Amino acid sequence: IESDLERAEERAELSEGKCAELEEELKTVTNNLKSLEAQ
Amino acid sequence: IESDLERAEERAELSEGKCAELEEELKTVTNNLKSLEAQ
């Protein structure tokens, strides 16, 4: 169970990292889309 | 440790679902950007 928790936590931190870069990517791309559409 | 593991798994499934939703959002926004970039 300790090993289970260990690799579950590894997958956890990978997941939060993924969510972080994907969220900032969405923010940047949405801002760019809005700016371009404003023209 | 079992109590920790159950809730670790539950949040792990939740984070996987959130990652899938974010990936779908990324796909939609990038398709929108590709469509808009034509003109």
CB neighbourhood size of B25 (10 A): 14
- Single-letter residue type at A36: L
For residue B37, the SS3 value is: coil
Instruction: Give dist(CA A27, CA B16) in Å, integer.
Output: 20
B22: its two tokens: 């974010």
Cβ atoms of residues A26 and B22 within 8 Å: yes
CA B10 to CA B16: how far, in whole Å?
Answer: 10
Give this entry's resolution in angstroms.
3.6
B residues 1..39 contacting A (CB < 8 A):
1-2, 4-5, 8-9, 11-12, 15-16, 18-19, 22-23, 25-26, 29-30, 32-33, 36
What experimental approach yielded this model? cryo-EM
Q: Do A33 and B29 touch (CB under 8 A)?
A: yes
Q: What is the dihedral of CA A27, A30, A32, A38, to 10 degrees?
A: -140
Tell me how far apart the alpha carbons of residues A26 and A6 are, in angstroms, rounded to a whole number.
30
